[PDB]
Design a protein around this ligand. Structure first.
Ligand SMILES: [Mg+2]
Lengths: 53, 294, 231, 66
RNA sequence: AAACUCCAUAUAUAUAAUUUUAAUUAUAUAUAAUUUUAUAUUAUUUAUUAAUAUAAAGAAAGGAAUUAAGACAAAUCAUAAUG
């Protein structure tokens, strides 16, 4: 499945609603998500050692 | 209970006192009244029957089966109005319903703004005042069924505030084209998106985007260049707030797919200077803007 | 100080928030009183379970959203709480269950115990086809009169006479009662079986413990078959 | 219960959030103060039809809740 | 649409100065069932379940009306009506 973009950018899409005025009131989650950014890299990571042996 | 004439004469009219006196001399005080469970003679509410109700009683002077006046003594000589208006407030408006006093003052934009606010929480004022709607495709489609060809109206519209926010909406209705446009206007507001704009007038660089069979080649333009693009792209740029743009469409020139392709290109094919700088850890300078700075 | 609008029920986002909230309240009681023993007279099948009807519960349990299986789940928990030992039950359980008990107390029944009249006679009416019969049963020695005439005179068919005797044969009281039967309408078969039905209904006053045997024999059931206009 | 939140354990009705007015409009809302105590103020029919959207959704089994 | 219903059936109340007598009746109103309950067995998706039997309770066992669409350009210009 394609790497989704819209689930991790709710803060940025919401911020456009507030700046334009389409959304009058800031949501309660808005401040919490802004202070705790989601991880949005979704990359494959190399590994150089077998942790067991 | 039997009451003295004095008491009864302070509540009931004199004309009715004789009847009350005769009834209190014929019905013994120890009468045990029984309730009839076959025939309901009296009304379901209490009533002394001393006053004639203007609505629930027969109108005095009107002819009817139980009219007591002689046929030459009726007093209804005007027949242009309803004789017995409704009682009380004068209406039977169901609780929770409003009198349709004004019709045609309803605005499809205001109907979209009210419904969307209740369904999604968007501000009605912004929709009814800040947004501009432009139909892009309006055609009739048909489905072949056993009963016969069923026609439907298809409407593709674009909405935007001319300040970066633009949305595309589609709507279908078997009844009329106006209903299809209302649904498309409703859908477009729900799909509103922000598009990056360089200096709030144009796009960042050039875009070569493929949306299905549509090949879109969009080039950024100098200030005052204007919109020199396919007519479908022109309308979207107007709503989105793009003022300067050049470009060509190759292969498929289907209006519907050009509009969707353009919206997709403006979001998925652009990168702001700020986003490029942060990703690369470099400073990007607009030479033209620096040349006119202090 | 600042005020906000929030869903009333914790189950707001469920399919039937009203039913789920009620089930949760009952489930809490069944958890808090898990240890309380249940009635051992439940084996004796205590005849107490006046629970509200599915339609009545739909007023409080989501209306159209209410599903039959959801109503079945409410009854399984209402009965389990109800079947807790009466001595060891508490107010909390009874209060919660009170809201689910059907209410038909404002009105009363219309049935008055049947008793023998001033002359020791049990009077019952019976109907079969177009015939009707009013019988007077008294304690006696087996004497029968039909419309003032001897049984063999009025009813020529022995099968009709045997039908009249059958209810008395079931309770083995053929020689213990005198019957004065009066009948009108229909024919011999309708009248004989209308008398049969009326004797069975009149014999219950003398010993109400034999009603079950009369019902099982089929003599207390009114035959509904009548001539039907062809359609 | 311990977060003064909400839960759904039986079935997520498709459209609960996007079609909230046709699914959740009939259910009752309430006004509460900063202490989460019911204010008891009667709500206008306008306030009782507005979508009440969750601020945060926690999903235990996302593979079955696409 | 089903149904709700109306009819039939069972019962209750009211009415009849029981010679308009059929009071074993007449006809108004209301009630009742789409029956219910437990028990063993057999299957199950085994559960807050079905198919059976069994005991218990009950008078309780039957009908109705109407239409949603479309076809036969089926009958009727002689039931009447129109070009
Ligand atoms: Mg008589």
């Amino acid at each position: 499945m394609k790497i989704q973009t819209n689930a991790v950018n709710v803060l940025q899409r919401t911020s456009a609603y507030l700046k334009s005025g389409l959304l009058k009131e800031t949501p309660a989650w808005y401040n919490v998500v802004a202070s705790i950014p989601p991880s949005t890299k979704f990359t494959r990571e190399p590994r150089f050692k077998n942790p067991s042996n | 209970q039997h009451y003295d004439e004095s008491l009864l004469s302070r509540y009931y009219p004199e004309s009715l006192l004789k009847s009350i006196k005769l009834a209190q001399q014929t019905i013994p005080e120890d009468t045990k009244f029984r309730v009839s469970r076959n025939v309901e003679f009296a009304p379901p509410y209490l009533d002394d029957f001393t006053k004639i109700h203007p609505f629930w009683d027969y109108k005095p002077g009107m002819p009817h089966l139980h009219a007591q006046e002689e046929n030459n003594n009726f007093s209804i000589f005007r027949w242009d109005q309803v004789q017995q208006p409704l009682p009380g407030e004068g209406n039977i408006l169901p609780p929770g319903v409003s009198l349709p006093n004004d019709g045609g003052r309803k605005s499809k934009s205001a109907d979209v703004a009210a419904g969307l606010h209740k369904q999604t929480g968007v501000d009605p004022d912004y929709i009814t005042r800040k947004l501009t709607m432009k139909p892009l495709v309006m055609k009739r489609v048909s489905n072949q069924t056993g009963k016969g060809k069923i026609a439907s109206f298809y409407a593709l519209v674009v909405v935007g505030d001319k300040n970066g926010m633009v949305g595309l909406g589609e709507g279908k209705s078997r009844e009329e084209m106006s209903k299809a446009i209302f649904k498309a206007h409703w859908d477009a507001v729900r799909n509103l998106k922000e598009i990056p704009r360089y200096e709030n007038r144009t796009i960042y660089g050039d875009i070569d985007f493929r949306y299905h069979g549509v090949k879109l080649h969009l080039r950024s333009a100098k200030p005052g260049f204007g919109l020199r693009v396919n007519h479908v792209i022109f309308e979207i740029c107007e709503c989105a707030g793009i003022k300067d743009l050049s470009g060509k469409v190759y292969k498929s020139r289907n209006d519907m797919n050009i509009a969707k392709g353009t919206i997709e290109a403006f979001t998925k094919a652009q990168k702001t200077l700020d986003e490029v700088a942060l990703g690369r850890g470099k400073k990007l300078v607009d030479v033209r803007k620096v040349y006119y700075s202090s | 100080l600042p005020r906000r609008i929030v869903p009333k029920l914790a189950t707001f986002y469920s399919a039937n928030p009203n039913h789920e909230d009620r089930i949760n309240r009952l489930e809490r009681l069944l958890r808090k009183y898990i240890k309380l023993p249940s009635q051992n007279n439940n084996e004796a099948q205590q005849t107490k379970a006046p629970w509200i009807s599915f339609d009545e519960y739909a007023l409080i349990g989501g209306g159209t959203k209410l599903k039959p299986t959801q109503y079945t789940q409410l009854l399984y928990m209402l009965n389990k709480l109800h079947n807790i030992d009466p001595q060891l039950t508490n107010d909390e359980i009874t209060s919660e269950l009170s809201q689910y008990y059907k209410k038909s107390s404002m009105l009363s029944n219309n049935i008055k115990i049947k008793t023998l009249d001033e002359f020791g006679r049990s009077i019952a009416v019976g109907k079969r086809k177009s015939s009707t019969a009013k019988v007077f049963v008294v304690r006696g020695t087996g004497e029968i009169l039909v419309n003032g005439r001897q049984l063999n005179d009025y009813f020529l068919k022995m099968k009709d006479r045997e039908s009249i005797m059958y209810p008395l044969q079931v309770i083995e009281s053929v020689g213990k009662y005198n019957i004065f039967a009066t009948t009108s309408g229909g024919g011999p078969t309708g009248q004989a079986e209308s008398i049969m039905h009326a004797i069975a209904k009149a014999l219950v006053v003398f010993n109400p413990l034999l009603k079950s045997r009369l019902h099982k024999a089929g003599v207390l059931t009114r035959d509904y078959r009548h001539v039907e206009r062809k359609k | 219960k311990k977060t003064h939140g909400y839960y759904v354990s039986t079935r997520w009705i498709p459209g609960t959030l996007t079609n909230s007015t046709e699914i959740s409009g009939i259910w009752e809302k309430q006004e509460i103060d900063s202490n989460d105590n019911p204010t008891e103020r009667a709500l206008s029919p306008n306030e009782t039809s507005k979508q009440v959207k969750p601020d945060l959704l926690v999903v235990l089994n996302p593979t079955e809740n696409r």
